[PDB]
Amino acid sequence: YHEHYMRNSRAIGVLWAIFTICFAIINVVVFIQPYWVGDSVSTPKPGYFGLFHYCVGSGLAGRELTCRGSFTDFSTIPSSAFKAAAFFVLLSMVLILGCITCFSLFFFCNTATVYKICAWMQLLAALCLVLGCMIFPDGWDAETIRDMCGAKTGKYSLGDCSVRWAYILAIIGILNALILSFLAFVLGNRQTD
């Protein structure tokens, strides 16, 4: 019985780490790729935008997507809500990367202790991602986003635009972070036996 116990624990820990790396990739992708919201057929003017970066069409029956925005320079971010959301998503990415670094502690530190460490860090990353996703719609009142989507757009109001893959992928990342955190807690309590 004990050998099966240890084998299942080891394998499930390996899968947990694999999915942790996958969630870190997801967090990096959503943080970088600017496809959180996008135009629609009824939108006055095309483009897309993410946490900080935004590309907007010139509006002459072509693309000419002029692009502007960078987390390094906070001046060009449209709104304070966007700045807060970008900072929270960055903090979540740093936290999950810290857990992937803390995987190195398995040589020396006790397995339960490091499992609880990454459990808490993944939970904190999930909380940060939740706050980022809840705060990001608050900045839709910005003049750039309103000029893009239209006058009907507003605070926590999608309007004419449509959410693109990055937003739903961030929500999926939130769910993944919660389940991975609980998984890490259960594994840490399970190694103790």
């Binding site: 990367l97 190195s104 502690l105 202790t113 808490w120």
Partner: protein
């Protein structure tokens, strides 16, 4: 509960840890290279490929 463990018994590992400080250099020989290598991978992929 899930494991019959109270909040403290299930979440915080405040039962051992500090005591393990003599092995601080032991962690750093693998913690620091991992963090730098991980930082480079996100840095270079972000600027070269993702954007």
């Amino acid at each position: 509960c899930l494991d019959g463990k109270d909040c403290a018994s299930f979440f915080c590992c405040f039962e051992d840890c500090h005591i393990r400080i003599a092995k601080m250099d032991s962690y750093a020989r693998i913690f620091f290279p991992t963090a730098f290598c991980l930082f480079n991978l996100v840095y270079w992929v972000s600027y070269l490929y993702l954007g």
